């Protein structure tokens, strides 16, 4: 992504919302922005909470969703305007109805403008709507998994990444991350039990993408080997990028 220190940037907390849907996306000294989201098929609903941390009412409180270029087609967001007046210590909510059209990489931008004490306040933060949010976990026996694993022919559909662990390589947290990521977590597939296997279908209006994944941790070297095999090259690429940043 962008170069430079990611503190006070539009994406300080973005990565914390890839494998979970709830939490505080952003908070400065006047406003706290929280999220709660739910997904099903190629659709989702994201609640955005605007908490006024001051004792002063905000005015002309205007949050707007912006989807840059390709995203303008791959994702369709619909939402209702929010009450422009926000009491001190109060919270206003915004429900965003999400429709995934095709697989995507970019993230929508949430721009918030309001008046506080007669001054212009302007905030811009990346919204955590990611491709993996449209997963349907698909449980299956190991023989069925290998059968599908070996049906991949297009080399562009396989994407591998060997990278350095960015966080302690804790077994239980790893499991919770894969599950939160979206695919089914399949033990009993890789003969090596310390490895992790996932399977699921990514759902979009125009195409359903079957996805398989293998994560091989190397505890001594503090590294991981991640392999994505899916029915669409750009999905294998995007999912591999996303998941790799989580470990």
């Amino acid at each position: 992504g962008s170069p430079g220190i990611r503190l006070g940037s539009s994406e300080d907390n973005f990565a914390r919302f890839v494998c979970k849907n709830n939490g505080v996306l952003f908070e400065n000294q006047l406003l706290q922005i929280g999220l709660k989201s739910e997904f099903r098929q190629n659709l989702g609903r994201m609640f955005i909470f605007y908490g006024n941390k001051t004792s002063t009412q905000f005015l002309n409180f205007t949050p707007t969703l912006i989807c840059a270029d390709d995203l303008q087609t791959n994702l369709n967001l619909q939402t209702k305007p929010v009450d422009p007046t926000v009491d001190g210590g109060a919270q206003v909510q915004q429900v965003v109805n999400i429709e995934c059209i095709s697989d995507f990489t970019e993230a929508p931008v949430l721009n918030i403008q309001f008046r506080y004490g007669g001054t212009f306040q302007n905030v811009s933060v990346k919204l955590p709507i990611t491709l993996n949010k449209f997963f349907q976990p698909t449980e299956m026996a190991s023989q069925d998994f290998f059968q599908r694993w070996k049906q991949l022919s297009n080399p562009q559909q396989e994407v591998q990444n060997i990278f350095k662990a960015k966080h302690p390589m804790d077994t239980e947290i790893t499991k919770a991350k894969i599950i939160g990521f979206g695919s089914a977590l399949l033990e009993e597939v890789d003969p090596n039990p310390a490895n992790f296997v996932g399977a699921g279908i990514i759902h979009t209006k125009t195409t359903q993408i079957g996805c398989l994944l293998r994560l091989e941790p190397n505890l001594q070297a503090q590294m991981y080997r991640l392999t994505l095999r899916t029915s669409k090259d750009t999905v294998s690429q995007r999912l591999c990028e996303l998941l790799s940043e989580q470990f």
Partner: peptide, 5 residues
């Protein structure tokens, strides 16, 4: 042996 390849 190794079903992975």
């Amino acid at each position: 042996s190794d079903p992975w390849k």
